[PDB]
Amino acid sequence: NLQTFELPTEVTGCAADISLGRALIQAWQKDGIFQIKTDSEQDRKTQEAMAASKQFCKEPLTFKSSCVSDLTYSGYVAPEIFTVCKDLSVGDQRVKAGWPCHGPVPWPNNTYQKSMKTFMEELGLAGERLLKLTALGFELPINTFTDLTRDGWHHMRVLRFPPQTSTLSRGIGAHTDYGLLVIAAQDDVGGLYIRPPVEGEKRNRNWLPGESSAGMFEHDEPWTFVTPTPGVWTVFPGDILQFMTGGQLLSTPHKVKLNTRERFACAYFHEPNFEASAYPLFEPSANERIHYGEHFTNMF
């Protein structure tokens, strides 16, 4: 199986947290992913969001397509995805000033708004502790990553996957997410596969042109099946972790396969500020940076 840890309530940076930080990096560098055990109030929010996600998907398509905005990438698309970005009314200057991807979220209904908003503030805390723990394992100052994520561009991909309807069973091709770290959630259906770090396997750097990671290693072994187990969130690093860590963490490649049954899932992104420039940690004299504002607009 894959390891299962329980984060503290607050990461103060003590001997126990730093040990957990080492336990995290190790699990990432061996298995490419691990699980964090949710409590009762974390599993309640996770299921209530999946609940609001399940009712929305069975609504008529003619309604779902209305949940779109020409100001944000938020809203519905046809798997059928509902992305939730930072919710900024047209009263917010960033939306007025015409900042790209800034604007309100076309929620289907307010009970979908509340259930998804409360889920996503909890994932933001688990991500902040994970970002504090990662720095402690690399012997970095505990606030190294969390300094970038103040009012960070956290967003989500509320996912539903159809059952296998043709003789093709592809739901999503091999890819690596483009953020700092991803926090996935999932029901009992199952269908998520990830690729661990393979020794000596060249990994393209997806934040650079001409070095895309998409579709790569898709048909080549191995691909760890991420089992549906009760009350856990799986955590794996994104492209911006790999860039900052200088490859000492690999952006976990993942792909989805369609099951016999309907599959609902989640995909939270704990990201830097939209005005934040990620930097390589172990090469200070290197002038390469990723500005998440243009990065997010580009990958979408």
Please give the Cα distance from 38 to 230 (Å, whole number): 9
Residue type (1 letter), 97: A
Q: Which residues contact 158 (CB under 8 A, 6 or more apart)?
A: 49, 53, 81, 82, 83, 84, 116, 266
Which of the ranges 170-178, 214-222, 239-247, 271-279 carries the binding residues for Ni ion, by CB under 5 A? 170-178
Q: CA-CA distances (angstroms) from residue 50 to 46, 64, 142?
A: 6, 16, 33
- The residue (of 177 and 239) whose beta carbon lies closer to Ni ion is 177
The alpha carbons of the chain give a radius of gyration, in whole angstroms, of 19
CB of residue 254 to Ni ion, shortest distance in Å: 6
- Smallest gap from Cβ 179 to Ni ion, in A, equals 9
Nearest approach, Cβ of residue 267 and Ni ion (Å) = 6
Nearest distance from C-beta of residue 242 to Ni ion, angstroms: 14
- Considering the complex, state which of residue 149 and residue 213 has its C-beta at the smaller distance from Ni ion: 213
Of 17, 122, 177, 271, the one binding Ni ion by CB under 5 A: 177
> Position of tokens 């919710």?
87
Q: After which residues is the chain broken (C to N over 2.5 A)?
A: 78
Beta bridge partners of 216: none
- Restricted to residues 120-159, the positions that interact with Ni ion (CB under 5 A) are none
Counting contacts by CB under 5 A, is residue 239 touching Ni ion?
no
Tell me how many residues contact Ni ion (CB under 5 A).
1
In this complex, which beta carbon is closest to Ni ion, that of residue 17 or of residue 177? 177
Q: Which residues bind Ni ion (CB under 5 A)?
A: 177
